[PDB]
Structure formats: C-alpha cells, structure tokens
Amino acid sequence: MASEGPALYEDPPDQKTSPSGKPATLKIASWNVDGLRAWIKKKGLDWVKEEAPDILCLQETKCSENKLPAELQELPGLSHQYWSAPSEGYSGVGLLSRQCPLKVSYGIGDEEHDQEGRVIVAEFDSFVLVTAYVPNAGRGLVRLEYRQRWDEAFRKFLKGLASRKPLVLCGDLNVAHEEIDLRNPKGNKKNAGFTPQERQGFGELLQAVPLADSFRHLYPNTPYAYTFWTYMMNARSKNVGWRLDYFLLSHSLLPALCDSKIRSKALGSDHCPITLYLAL
Ligand SMILES: [Sm+3]
Ligand SMILES: [Sm+3]
C-alpha cells in the first residue's frame, strides 16, 4: 500500500555568519508544541534551555492564558512572555523574548479572524516579528473556504506591516508550498495542507508582501526536509512528513540571513522546532 520507506535527512551544521561575514546576533526558535502542558511534560523546555534562543515562538499551546504551567517561570533568558488564546483548550500562540519588545499586539486587525488566538506581533528596534498558527483547512476540507479568507486577510495585514519595518514571519503556516515540501505530494493533492487553494495562497503571500522562504532560499533543491510527521503510521521514523513550519523574511533582511534550521532530532511534539540565525 504505502510506497515510502526511510528517506534520510541530516540538517547541515549551523552557519552563524552572514554572506558578508557578520556573525549572527539574533537567534529565533519556533515550535508547534501540540499542547503547552503536554510538551512541557515531555521536557520541551530542556531543549529550549540548551538551544538558548533570544526569542521563542510557540504555536498550538491549547492553554488558557490564566492556566500557564509554572515551569515557564524557570526561563531566565526569556522573561518577557506573551500569550494569546481563543476568545479554551485549542489553538493559541506564545512569544517569549530575552529583550523586551517595543510593543506587542495580538491578531491581524480583522475581528472575524482574531478570535482564535493565532497571532502575536512583537515590534523591535530594527524589525517586527510575527508568529502565527494558521487555520487548518480541516478534514474533508470543511474549513478551506474560511482558510482562503484568512489567507487574504493575513496577506494584506502583513503587507501593511512590511511597508513600514522589515518583517520576520514564523510559525505553523499549515501548508507545504511545493512538491519538495512533503513526502507524498501525489496522494495529498486533495488534503488539507496541500490543496491548490492553499499552495497558491502561500505563493501569493511570498509575492505580495513580498517575503522570502528562508530555508528554501538557502537550500533550494534539498529534499526530505520536513517539520511535521503524523504520530500515527510510524511516520517520523520513515521521514514521511511535511514542511509546515517556516521563517519568511522581507527581502531587505536577506543580506542578514545566516541560516534557517530544522531541528529534526528534537522530540516533544509531532512537529520539530525550526531556528533562524540573523545578523542584525
Ligand atoms: Sm496538533
Ligand atoms: Sm511545482
């Protein structure tokens, strides 16, 4: 039945200097934790402590802002913590930072799309950071029409932000852009995450803002690089996954891009974390 066996992928070593030789000054980690409490129970924070990022973005926290695990109070290097949950138990995002942002905002300015705690905007001196947990198209694509409306509203919102300050977007964008972004493109053409509607949406986001796919920019032809594997069917051991997590940057930030990583070995969720190195 299934045609996939193991496909090897070894993320290359961390490139910590930009094309001009400037060492990375900013390290950002993004991770769909599939439940903040479950993830922490699975020692997610031990990985964070070792990675020591300047900023940590989390998606799918599924946790009430008033029920945050006490273990989060043990992250000395990430004392500035912000969260956003649905207008409990689902969706939700978080953003933890070493340095205090100039301003933090929630949502994308559209009431219809701001009730499920999917976006946090943190403005810094030289750039604005947005982390998002994009709405899934759903089983049977029952939420694809809504997803298309979200895609348009999100694209417009981001273009607005980027028109004033360099932008960095990270998170679970719930879509594998190209065939190279998932192990089984032929069998998922009508499934959430790989529909023409979703893929065209991602392509338009890149063109309209405009934004560049950091990982693909550096590794244009590298296959089998995924960030999500279903917990079922022993998918992760066979590397039958999807690259749903990204770091999209304004073109003006490309000269500061050092590396965009996929931490394939970090356990604790059905998604692995991704890390960005910028020389700002
Ligand atoms: Sm999940
Ligand atoms: Sm293609």
Curated annotation (Swiss-Prot):
Resulting phenotype, K261A: Reduces the interaction with TOMM20. Abolishes localization in the mitochondria
Annotated S-S bridges: A29-C57
Keyword vocabulary terms for this entry: Acetylation, Activator, Cleavage on pair of basic residues, Cytoplasm, Disulfide bond, DNA damage, DNA recombination, DNA repair, DNA-binding, Endonuclease, Endoplasmic reticulum, Exonuclease, Hydrolase, Magnesium, Metal-binding, Mitochondrion, Nuclease, Nucleus, Phosphoprotein, Repressor, RNA-binding, S-nitrosylation, Transcription, Transcription regulation, Ubl conjugation
Effect of N32A: Nearly abolishes AP endodeoxyribonuclease activity
Effect caused by changing C272S: Does not abolish NO-induced nitrosylation. Abolishes NO-induced nitrosylation and translocation from the nucleus to the cytoplasm
Inducing factors: Up-regulated in presence of reactive oxygen species (ROS), like bleomycin, H(2)O(2) and phenazine methosulfate.
Effect of N174A: Abolishes AP endodeoxyribonuclease activity
Region described as Mitochondrial targeting sequence (MTS): 251-280
Record note on what altering C63A does: Does not abolish the redox activity
Recorded consequence of changing R263A: Reduces the interaction with TOMM20. Abolishes localization in the mitochondria
Site (Interaction with DNA substrate): H271
PTM notes: Phosphorylated. Phosphorylation by kinase PKC or casein kinase CK2 results in enhanced redox activity that stimulates binding of the FOS/JUN AP-1 complex to its cognate binding site. AP-endodeoxyribonuclease activity is not affected by CK2-mediated phosphorylation. Phosphorylation of Thr-195 by CDK5 reduces AP-endodeoxyribonuclease activity resulting in accumulation of DNA damage and contributing to neuronal death. Acetylation is increased by the transcriptional coactivator EP300 acetyltransferase, genotoxic agents like H(2)O(2) and methyl methanesulfonate (MMS). Acetylation increases its binding affinity to the negative calcium response element (nCaRE) DNA promoter. The acetylated form induces a stronger binding of YBX1 to the Y-box sequence in the MDR1 promoter than the unacetylated form. Deacetylated on lysines.
Catalytic reaction list: a deoxyribonucleotide-2'-deoxyribose-5'-monophosphate-DNA + H2O = a 5'-end 2'-deoxyribose-5'-monophosphate-DNA + a 3'-end 2'-deoxyribonucleotide-DNA + H(+); Exonucleolytic cleavage in the 3'- to 5'-direction to yield nucleoside 5'-phosphates; a 3'-end 2'-deoxyribonucleotide-3'-phosphoglycolate-DNA + H2O = 2-phosphoglycolate + a 3'-end 2'-deoxyribonucleotide-DNA + H(+); a 3'-end 2'-deoxyribonucleotide-8-oxoguanine-DNA + H2O = 8-oxo-dGMP + a 3'-end 2'-deoxyribonucleotide-DNA + H(+)
Enzyme class label: hydrolase
UniProt site (Transition state stabilizer): N174
Cofactor remark from the record: Probably binds two magnesium or manganese ions per subunit.
Active-site annotation: Y133, D172, H271
Needed cofactors: Mg(2+); Mn(2+)
Subunit structure: Monomer. Homodimer; disulfide-linked. Component of the SET complex, composed of at least APEX1, SET, ANP32A, HMGB2, NME1 and TREX1. Associates with the dimer XRCC5/XRCC6 in a DNA-dependent manner. Interacts with SIRT1; the interaction is increased in the context of genotoxic stress. Interacts with HDAC1, HDAC2 and HDAC3; the interactions are not dependent on the APEX1 acetylation status. Interacts with XRCC1; the interaction is induced by SIRT1 and increased with the APEX1 acetylated form.
Additional observations: Extract of mitochondria, but not of nuclei or cytosol, cleaves recombinant APEX1 to generate a mitochondrial APEX1-sized product. The specific activity of the cleaved mitochondrial endodeoxyribonuclease appears to be about 3-fold higher than that of the full-length form.
Protein name: DNA repair nuclease/redox regulator APEX1
Species of the source: Homo sapiens (Human)
Classification of source organism: Eukaryota, Metazoa, Chordata, Craniata, Vertebrata
Gene: APEX1
